[PDB]
Amino acid sequence: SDKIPVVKVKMKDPNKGPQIKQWPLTNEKIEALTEIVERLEREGKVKRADPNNPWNTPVFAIKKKSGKWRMLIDFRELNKLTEKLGLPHPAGLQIKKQVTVLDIGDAYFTIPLDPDYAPYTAFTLPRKNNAGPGRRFVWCSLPQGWILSPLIYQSTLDNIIQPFIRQNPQLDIYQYMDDIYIGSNLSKKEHKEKVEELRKLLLWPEDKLQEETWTIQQKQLDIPEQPTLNELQKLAGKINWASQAIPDLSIKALTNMMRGNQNLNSTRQWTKEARLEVQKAKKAIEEQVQLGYYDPSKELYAKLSLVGPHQISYQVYQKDPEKILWYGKMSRQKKKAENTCDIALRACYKIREESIIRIGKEPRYEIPTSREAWESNLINSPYLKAPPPEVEYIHAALNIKRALS
Amino acid sequence: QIKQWPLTNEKIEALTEIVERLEREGKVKRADPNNPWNTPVFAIKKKSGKWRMLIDFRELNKLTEKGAQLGLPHPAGLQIKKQVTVLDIGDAYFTIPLDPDYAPYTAFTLPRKNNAGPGRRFVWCSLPQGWILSPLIYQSTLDNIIQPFIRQNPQLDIYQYMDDIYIGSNLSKKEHKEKVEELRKLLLWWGFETPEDKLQEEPPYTWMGYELHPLTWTIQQKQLDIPEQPTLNELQKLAGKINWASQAIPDLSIKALTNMMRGNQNLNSTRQWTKEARLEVQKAKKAIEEQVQLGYYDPSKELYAKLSLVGPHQISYQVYQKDPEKILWYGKMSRQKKKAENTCDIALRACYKIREESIIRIGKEPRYEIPTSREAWESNLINSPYLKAPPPEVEYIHAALNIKRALSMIKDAPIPGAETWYIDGGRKLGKAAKAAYWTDTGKWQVMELEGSNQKAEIQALLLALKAGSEEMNIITDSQYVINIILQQPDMMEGIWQEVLEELEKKTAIFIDWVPGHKGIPGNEEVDKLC
């Protein structure tokens, strides 16, 4: 059940495609998964692969609430290597009274895919304990989580969708990977109404954010009244760190205010030149966070740190001129079991929603872990809601830990 | 691609007969005059028979374009069955015709009296030749032939490895036999014949170089033989046997023996035993002999992984079940010579490896038993978190040795009353580098040692401490040393080992960091090293 023009699609090199090995899956996940895939080869949305096909892409499954299982595909590697329109990111979306987000996903099943490119969408289905070779599969529908599907979808339903935006221009509509973002300032009633209308439009209201309650975290530089030598060496290192990207900061006056007996327990009394220099740095750092400094031509980054136990702090920011765009916490939550990698995943998803609502894109996530600890916490975990964040592995550095706290 | 190797005159007398006996039945033909490629043909004499002609095909198995059989089925993942059959699909590639547009790269020259004339070139037409690259032609087509039978019969446990099918069931002998005949029928209807003489059906089973018994499996082929003039063929067979035994036993390395394999890929050429890759082969030799036996997984029982500890640079573990104490498999996690890991961290890494293996083989995660107090685990390496960690929720056992907390550092609130130190090193003029320390009390000294700037900056450390009290405050301008200290290692290499070795003696250290080269009180005077 699909006939509509095939948006033809090209690799950045037909020779260089995704060769990624499949994750280990539980008994339960293989059961649910082979059920899903077998059904979708009945309906024709998937088909068996060519015996000389060298590509693969990982698949996994999650327990969508109600226990009904769901198949997700990690298209991270393929997405980089293809990139062959749109409905653009509305500036007003981030200042709407409410913004409902809706999964489409299913409509993709009704849309064909370029069969000269589908060979690269291949994914292996494994069996428990390698009892047989994996059963390989290439795609026939628009695959969910694919990079070029929001385009091929939006251009395929262009003729029915853009009517509904030129009418009702009080709504700000956007689409990221497979989710549609409906933002409005109407009352809860008529908002629910129009979102219902648009749901039945793509039949051819689950999650709802209110991005005002999103604070700014308002970083602070604590200044003790009766300091010790060590409290001021921390103070010094921290401000020397700030001066690497903030102009007109100095640690000289307090540098020689720290002169005397050199036991870390020795006190100092506050001079006036150093106390004022300290104040200059303090108000220089509080006001540092500025989203208005975003540069759409540079890469966007989000860096995480474990600021003591049970709590991740992150900064979404940009490089060569280091400009912090916003900050954020994510505290381990009480009842459920949770390791630090899980708080990092949760944080990554919170960053994902914020960044999509404001910039319209996702940052690169810089996480202080190893490829082995991460990527083993995801293969068999709960807390995994979406395709995994694309991750850069960084070394823990004390200046950044002290900065984000 | 490759040049036909020298071949003993009494091998072609007996290999031309196999090649001629093969072009007669048609499995080969003559290549083309223009066929530029080649592959060597070797001849080994199987004990008490005729000469088995074995072709390499290792070179071209890379230019014959790629594909994508995701590991091995592990016999501990089989469960105990009242009835077991092992079908062998003989006629492996032997009659099954081969793609003619890939058929040219099949070329192999053959000697007459080793160049009494020019070489007789041949090309494999009918068979894929019993080569190694059956998994392409074999596994995914067999899998789709028998997958309907698999879905039809959930009461059976089927396992397809290269040319063995394994069928395990709890039906009676008669119903089981009938079903095995059902699948044999299905196989013949698609071309795959199962000869009655290679069937197993009987008390011990050969299966991927394992031996399956009712309660127990073990490594096939209970004796490793070390030849004193090792040709590379015999060596490769030794690496295969070792790799099979490596699924049951841990800690069996192939690396010095694979290093001992090198260029001159002739499988009747030889090597000479390097010293390390004889100790590997002898260690594996005694491990394999005096056999071990392991169990099958019991889905009706809790699964366990127990970490045991001896030596500070290795964590051993067993995946096993309880109340007969059935052991499913063993494994090791070794220390990293460069990294700043302590033993808690090696335990964590072992948990990662176990989680992977268990999920592949069993389909679930075991309960983790580790020898440590809840204190030395919840605090160490999950609450002193340089970098982050995915532990499970865990059962702590008390064993012969346990994992203890890393170090004696007291993080918050630098120690009241002990004298602060300051310390620095490096500043390479030329070869000359130095190291030194100063304290709030007058004490001070310079070392003026050899090394690099980094080793000079750690060698700076250990001299505040060798010359220090039992309590301390160290402050340094090195991000390297402060970083390692924040990972909390409990054993390292080199001079770092000695600094770790002085942290033995002391009761309370507090180390901290301040920016170097900003003229900070304390750092500045110790910078005077040049």
Author numbering:
A (entry chain B): 2 to 85, 91 to 210, 216 to 223, 237 to 429
B (entry chain A): 20 to 87, 90 to 551
Q: Would you copy out the relevant sentences from the publication that reported this structure?
A:
Reverse transcriptase (RT) is the most common target for anti-AIDS drugs being the enzyme that catalyzes the central step in the HIV-1 replication cycle converting the viral RNA genome into DNA for subsequent integration into the host genome. RT is a heterodimeric protein of two subunits, p51 and p66, encoded by the p66 template and, therefore, identical in sequence except for lacking the C-terminal RNase-H domain in p51 as a result of proteolytic processing. The structure of p51 is rigid and provides structural support to the more flexible p66 subunit that undergoes functionally crucial conformational rearrangements. FIV closely parallels HIV-1 in its replication and pathogenicity however is resistant to all non-nucleoside inhibitors of HIV-1 RT.
To elucidate the mechanisms employed by fRT and promote our general understanding of NNRTI-resistance, we determined the 2.94 Å crystal structure of fRT. With 48% identity and 67% similarity, the fold of feline RT is conserved with the HIV-1 RT. The p51/p66 heterodimeric enzyme embraces the famous “right-hand” shape of p66, which superimposes on the “closed” form of unliganded HIV-1 RT (~ 2 Å RMSD). The fRT NNBP structure is conserved with HIV-1 with variances around the NNBP of fRT making no global change to the pocket size or shape. Intriguingly, a group of FIV variances clusters at the rim of the NNBP entryway. fRT is altered to K101Q, D192N, D177Q and V179D in the p66 subunit, and E28N, T139G, E138A, I135K and S134R, in the p51. Structural analysis suggests that variances at the fRT entryway could render a rigid pocket with a more of a “closed” conformation that could inhibit NNRTI binding. Particularly, Y181, which must flip upwards to open the NNBP, appears to be trapped by interactions with the conserved N136p51 and potentially with I135Kp51. The bulkier side chain of S134Rp51 may further contribute to a tighter entryway by filling more space at the p51/p66 interface and interacting (3.6 Å) with the carbonyl oxygen of I180. fRT also forms three additional bonds around the entryway: one salt bridge (K173R/T39Ep51) and two hydrogen bonds (K166N/K49Rp51, and backbone amine of Q182 with carbonyl oxygen of E138Ap51). Consequently, the pocket entrance of FIV p66 is constricted by ~ 2 Å as compared to that of HIV-1. FIV variances, especially at the p51 loop (S134R, I135K, E138A and T139G), have also altered the electrostatic properties around the entryway from negative to positive charges, which may interfere with initial drug channeling into the entrance and subsequent penetration and binding.
